[PDB]
Scaffold this active site. Structure first.
Site, short mmCIF file in Angstrom:
data_model
loop_
_atom_site.label_atom_id
_atom_site.label_comp_id
_atom_site.label_asym_id
_atom_site.label_seq_id
_atom_site.Cartn_x
_atom_site.Cartn_y
_atom_site.Cartn_z
N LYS A 93 21.79 40.59 44.51
CA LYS A 93 21.07 40.74 45.77
C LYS A 93 20.64 39.39 46.33
O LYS A 93 20.63 39.21 47.55
CB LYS A 93 19.84 41.62 45.58
CG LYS A 93 20.14 42.99 45.12
CD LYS A 93 18.91 43.83 45.13
CE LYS A 93 17.86 43.30 44.19
NZ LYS A 93 18.21 43.47 42.76
N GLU B 271 8.96 38.08 44.28
CA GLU B 271 10.14 37.78 43.48
C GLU B 271 9.87 36.50 42.71
O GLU B 271 8.72 36.11 42.58
CB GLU B 271 11.37 37.68 44.37
CG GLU B 271 12.11 39.00 44.53
CD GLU B 271 12.62 39.57 43.21
OE1 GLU B 271 12.24 40.70 42.87
OE2 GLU B 271 13.42 38.90 42.52
N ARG B 272 10.89 35.88 42.14
CA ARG B 272 10.64 34.72 41.29
C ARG B 272 10.27 33.50 42.11
O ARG B 272 10.83 33.26 43.17
CB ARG B 272 11.87 34.43 40.46
CG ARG B 272 12.30 35.57 39.63
CD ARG B 272 13.74 35.41 39.26
NE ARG B 272 14.16 36.45 38.35
CZ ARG B 272 14.59 37.64 38.72
NH1 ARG B 272 14.67 37.94 40.00
NH2 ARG B 272 14.95 38.52 37.82
N1 LIG Z 1 28.68 36.58 44.78
C1 LIG Z 1 28.52 36.18 43.50
N2 LIG Z 1 29.38 35.33 42.93
C2 LIG Z 1 29.24 34.94 41.65
N3 LIG Z 1 28.27 35.34 40.84
C3 LIG Z 1 27.34 36.20 41.29
C4 LIG Z 1 27.42 36.69 42.67
N4 LIG Z 1 26.39 37.52 42.85
C5 LIG Z 1 25.72 37.56 41.68
N5 LIG Z 1 26.28 36.78 40.76
C6 LIG Z 1 25.78 36.62 39.39
O1 LIG Z 1 24.76 37.59 39.19
C7 LIG Z 1 23.57 36.94 38.75
C8 LIG Z 1 22.35 37.68 39.25
O2 LIG Z 1 22.36 37.66 40.66
P1 LIG Z 1 21.02 37.60 41.50
O3 LIG Z 1 21.32 36.88 42.76
O4 LIG Z 1 19.93 37.11 40.60
O5 LIG Z 1 20.82 39.16 41.78
P2 LIG Z 1 19.40 39.90 41.70
O6 LIG Z 1 18.53 39.11 42.61
O7 LIG Z 1 19.75 41.27 42.14
O8 LIG Z 1 18.96 39.86 40.27
C9 LIG Z 1 23.66 35.57 39.36
O9 LIG Z 1 22.91 34.61 38.62
C10 LIG Z 1 25.13 35.28 39.27
O10 LIG Z 1 25.41 34.78 37.97
MG LIG Z 2 16.64 38.73 43.30
#
Ligand SMILES: Nc1ncnc2c1ncn2[C@@H]1O[C@H](COP(=O)(O)OP(=O)(O)O)[C@@H](O)[C@H]1O
Ligand SMILES: [Mg+2]
Lengths: 50, 521, 70, 141
Positions: free
Chosen positions: B154, B180-181
């Site tokens: 997300k 969030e963080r």
């Molecule tokens: N479009 C993307 N391309 C590559 N890796 C991704 C992508 N989206 C998510 N990830 C992987 O998923 C992990 C968690 O995504 P994150 O942005 O933290 O989602 P959320 O906020 O839902 O936890 C990221 O650290 C990354 O490693």
């Molecule tokens: Mg997030």
């Protein structure tokens, strides 16, 4: 071969109907238990305020 | 004239007022506290007592502490003077750049616009992300939801929507970081200094973004009102300056979680699975303000956390009726390596009508979803049997869907440190042209992983031609390279002797440090 | 240590530990960490990268090793 | 719109106002039933009305039942939906046809408000999301 696959795939639809029947009994028990659990959580939160 | 603290239970403070209680939703100030503690009246308890939620911690509150009524709700600075700054829930700058210049200060509480000043205009917001702009295309001026559980993507998807939509558009942006963080709020801040979206110093007026941050460490009273603070900055840009705003809200779920954390202490008996009884109407009061009116336009993009990947849960399920485009991210798409992990079937948009996006975009999107739905009905029988009884009509729709599945994957320009790939912006016409090729068999001869993490269909042909160079380029280095070289693979202690041996101190020496911290200050 | 992790992951991802029985990969890499050069770990720890002057120089030093069974 | 009324209690409206909107929409539609004409009432998200009524009841400290709903939440929807009738010929012969809309979650028709309205109504038009992506639209199971 076709006539032993027919007897093999009859014995596995029974095994997938006996397993499905045990899972539905297990699901109905969990369905009843989570309705009791969510309700005890709601009454406890209400009795703490009343 | 003023009130006094009568009860402190967690984040919920009761303030007793001898004469003329403050209005509900009004802001109170506790003087004598170590930090600025702002309370917000949630209800009148009935014996000249109000019940309040605190915007900061209540550690150190004393019964009897003087509370000053401000006479209005929480007022935050709005205007161009907040562009480039990070604000608090209460409008304080938390970026250490001085006070916030303010055109006006506005109450963070207002009503939804009206039914008469609603905008019935649908025009597509092109994002560059080809799974979005094909199957669930976003609306320029509408509410967009990014659903998905923990770790599906997300925040990367909302980061790629920032630099693909907000990096060059006409108006301003507001990022509301809701619960969030703190680490990724600093990551978003430093990324926008380098991208030039936020400029610091004397070039601050050329900024195009305002951050409003209420991250996870803040109490539930704070995180419940950050989304209203960031929306108020976006509502000034829409109502007063009359211009298009982008409003990014990371986890609008945390707004409902924050109200749920104080709710039983406010005297409410709990609703279903654990949320407050006012769950749908607290959420509805927020989302109804994020609208395109006849004055300007707020294009909202909200991440929505679904708890334990459950879209049935009441806080995601209530959000679904508030959005115009619900990009649902799935763990099963993420576990295969398709990124962005968008569920191509579960993602729904209101721009997916044929009289809105045309027929050659609607039929490709409905054609791609039909081939992906059929493959999921065959994947029940492939994973048992193994696709040797599948008719060669059903074998072709497995190969077509597997090409469609990888071709929805796209390298993101912000995920260049997760995936080692430079990111790809795909135009809308190149997405329609590509998936119409994969649907009608124009690219049936290409390999399956040639579609994986590429831009468009011209880069599938530049990758299939690349991989068929580089698999038959395997046997040049087999019979040689073990020996007989130009000696830039040199001897053993040749590489050991340029090792600059760093001095190890062989004791920590912290008790000399601990006495030295005593003499300083 | 991190340098003996990446050498053992190099020995498995550069195909030096097939032709090896899958039951004794646990005992195969115990040779691989102990029978390669104790000076090749120091270069990988000091550089932090397996350099082009080392990825051949270690994969040709991952051939002068005795693995069980083989 | 020359034949349609729209009663709109939106998301920002108070929970008493979303509770009363199917009833005030029904009374507007009961005009045509009672005067010999024919009506078509559609309560879009009757499951959102019950959430608004559960909000009022937990806040009025009424004792909650299953999924924190009141005791009289079956009586809520039955008293509303039983107002859709075909009248007899000595009462004009008018009619009112109701289409309550209930949103399930993961197709669960064993949910508490969903079993209530399935009991009250005559039929159901079940729309399944798995048929929706197969191209079968309207996705009628
Ligand atoms: N479009 C993307 N391309 C590559 N890796 C991704 C992508 N989206 C998510 N990830 C992987 O998923 C992990 C968690 O995504 P994150 O942005 O933290 O989602 P959320 O906020 O839902 O936890 C990221 O650290 C990354 O490693
Ligand atoms: Mg997030």
């Amino acid at each position: 071969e076709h006539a032993s696959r027919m007897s093999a795939m009859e014995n596995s639809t029974k095994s997938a109907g006996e397993m499905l029947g045990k899972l539905t009994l297990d699901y109905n028990r969990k369905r009843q238990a989570t309705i009791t659990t969510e309700l005890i959580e709601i009454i406890a939160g209400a009795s703490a305020l009343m | 004239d003023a009130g006094y603290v009568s009860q402190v239970i967690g984040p919920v403070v009761d303030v007793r007022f001898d004469g003329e209680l403050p209005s509900i939703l009004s802001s109170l100030e506790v003087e004598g506290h170590s930090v600025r503690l702002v309370l917000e009246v949630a209800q009148h308890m009935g014996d000249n007592t109000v019940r309040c939620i605190a915007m900061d911690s209540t550690d150190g509150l004393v019964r009897g502490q003087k509370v000053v009524d401000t006479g209005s709700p929480i007022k935050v600075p709005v205007g161009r003077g907040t562009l480039g700054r990070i604000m608090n829930v209460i409008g304080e700058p938390v970026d250490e750049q001085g006070p916030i210049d303010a055109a006006d200060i506005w109450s963070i509480h207002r009503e939804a616009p009206e039914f008469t000043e609603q905008s019935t205009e649908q025009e597509i917001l092109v994002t560059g992300i080809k799974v979005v702009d094909l199957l669930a295309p976003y609306q320029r001026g509408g509410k967009i939801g990014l659903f998905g559980g923990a770790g599906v993507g997300k925040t990367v998807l909302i980061m790629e929507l920032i630099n693909n939509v907000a990096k060059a558009h006409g108006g301003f942006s507001v990022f509301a970081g809701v619960g969030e963080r703190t680490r990724e709020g600093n990551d978003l801040y430093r990324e926008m200094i380098e991208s030039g979206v936020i400029k610091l110093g004397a070039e601050r007026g050329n900024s195009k973004c305002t951050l409003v941050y209420g991250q996870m460490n803040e109490p539930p009273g704070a995180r419940a009102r950050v989304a209203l603070t960031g929306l108020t900055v976006a509502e000034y840009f829409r109502d007063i300056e009359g211009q298009d705003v982008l409003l990014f809200v990371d986890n609008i779920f945390r707004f409902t979680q924050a109200n749920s954390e104080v709710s039983a202490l406010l005297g409410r008996i709990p609703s279903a699975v654990g949320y407050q009884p006012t769950l749908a109407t607290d959420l509805g009061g927020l989302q109804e303000r994020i609208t395109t009116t006849t004055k300007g336009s707020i294009t909202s993009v909200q991440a929505v956390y679904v708890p334990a990947d459950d879209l049935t849960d009441p806080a995601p399920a209530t959000t679904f009726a508030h959005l115009d485009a619900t990009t649902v991210l799935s763990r099963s798409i993420a576990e295969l390596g398709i990124y962005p992990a968008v569920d191509p079937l579960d993602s729904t948009s209101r721009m997916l009508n044929p009289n809105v996006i045309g027929a050659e975009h609607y039929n490709v999107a409905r054609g791609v979803q039909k081939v992906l739905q059929d493959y999921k009905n065959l994947q029940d029988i492939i994973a048992i049997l193994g696709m040797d009884e599948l008719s060669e009509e059903d074998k072709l729709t497995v190969a077509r869907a597997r090409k469609i599945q990888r071709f929805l994957s796209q390298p993101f320009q912000v995920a260049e440190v997760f995936t080692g790939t430079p990111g790809k912006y795909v135009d809308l016409a190149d997405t329609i042209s590509g998936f119409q090729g994969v649907l009608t068999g124009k690219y049936d001869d290409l390999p399956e992983m040639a579609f994986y993490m590429v831009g468009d269909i011209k880069e599938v042909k530049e990758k299939a031609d690349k991989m068929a160079k580089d698999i038959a380029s395997r046997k040049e280095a087999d019979n040689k390279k073990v020996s007989e070289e130009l000696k830039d693979i040199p001897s053993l202690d040749k590489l050991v002797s340029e090792i600059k041996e760093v001095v190890i101190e062989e004791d920590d020496g912290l008790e000399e440090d601990f006495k030295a911290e005593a003499l300083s200050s | 240590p991190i340098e003996r992790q990446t050498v053992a992951v190099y020995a498995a991802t550069k195909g030096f530990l097939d032709k090896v029985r899958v039951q004794d990969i646990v005992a195969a890499e115990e040779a691989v960490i102990s029978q390669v050069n104790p000076a090749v770990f120091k270069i990988l720890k000091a550089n932090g990268k397996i350099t082009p002057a080392l990825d051949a120089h270690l994969k040709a030093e991952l051939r002068k090793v005795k693995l069980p069974g083989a | 719109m020359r034949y349609t009324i729209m009663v709109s209690a939106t998301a920002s409206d108070a929970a008493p106002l979303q509770f009363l909107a199917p009833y005030s929409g029904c009374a507007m539609a009961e005009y045509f039933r009672d005067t010999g004409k024919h009506g078509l009432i559609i309560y879009d998200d009757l499951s959102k009305q019950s959430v608004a009524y559960r909000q009022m009841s937990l806040l009025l400290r009424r004792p909650p039942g299953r999924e924190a709903f009141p005791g009289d939440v079956f009586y809520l929807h039955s008293r509303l939906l039983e107002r859709a009738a075909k009248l007899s010929k000595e009462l004009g012969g008018g009619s009112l046809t109701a289409f309550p809309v209930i949103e399930t979650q993961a197709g669960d028709v064993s949910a508490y408000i969903a079993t209530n309205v399935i009991s009250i109504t005559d039929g159901q038009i079940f729309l399944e999301t798995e048929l929706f992506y197969k191209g079968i639209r309207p996705a009628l199971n």
